[PDB]
Amino acid sequence: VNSFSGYLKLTDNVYIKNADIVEEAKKVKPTVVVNAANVYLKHGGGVAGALNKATNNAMQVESDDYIATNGPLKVGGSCVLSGHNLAKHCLHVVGPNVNKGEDIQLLKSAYENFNQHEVLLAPLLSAGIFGADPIHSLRVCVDTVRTNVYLAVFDKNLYDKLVSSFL
Numbered sequence: 001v002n003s004f005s006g007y008l009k010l011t012d013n014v015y016i017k018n019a020d021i022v023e024e025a026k027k028v029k030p031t032v033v034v035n036a037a038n039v040y041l042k043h044g045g046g047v048a049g050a051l052n053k054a055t056n057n058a059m060q061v062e063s064d065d066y067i068a069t070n071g072p073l074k075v076g077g078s079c080v081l082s083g084h085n086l087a088k089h090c091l092h093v094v095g096p097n098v099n100k101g102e103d104i105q106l107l108k109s110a111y112e113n114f115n116q117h118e119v120l121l122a123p124l125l126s127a128g129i130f131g132a133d134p135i136h137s138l139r140v141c142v143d144t145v146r147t148n149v150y151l152a153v154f155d156k157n158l159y160d161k162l163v164s165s166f167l
């Protein structure tokens with residue numbers, strides 16, 4: 001028994017709720033929150049900008065030091081950094097950005113990073129401003145992640161479509 005309240009059960013290990021991931025993190029303070037990162041950890045908009053604003057830019061400050069030492073991530077890759085005021089840890093995961101010409105097949109590799117953590121609060125990778133279809137992202141998530149994932153979907157109409165079309 002963990003602290004996630006109001007999630008609807010989709011599979012043995014995947015749960016879904018209509019809420020902003022940033023607001024879910026502030027309330028729950030999970031062990032791991034997943035950020036929809038880019039390879040530069042430049043958190044300007046979307047999930048990344050939203051979570052970073054909630055950290056008063058401390059996420060960006062930590063991220064810039066990480067990149068200065070280690071260089072960019074790979075598309076499909078991840079790193080673990082502080083969760084600041086939102087979580088114990090933030091798992092920054094880079095899904096392909098199809099609006100930028102990146103390969104959608106890399107979405108499975110991105111979700112595989114979740115398997116290194118027993119429980120995660122997460123958004124739909126590669127969706128939103130990354131350009132992939134949310135329905136597809138949920139399918140890859142369910143078919144790739146084996147650990148316990150709590151998906152927070154901000155958009156009510158998208159949430160309803162994801163639940164109603166789920167196979």
Ligand SMILES: Cc1nnc2n1C[C@@H](C(=O)O)N(C(=O)c1ccc(NC(=O)NC3CC3)cc1)C2
Pocket residue numbers: 020021022036046047050123124127128129134152153154155156158159
């Ligand atoms: C439509 C559509 N198609 N795909 C998606 N969306 C909307 C949204 C969702 O979950 O429904 N998605 C995101 O990536 C996202 C989710 C949450 C956030 N938080 C956010 O801005 N907080 C504001 C500042 C307080 C930003 C971006 C995926």
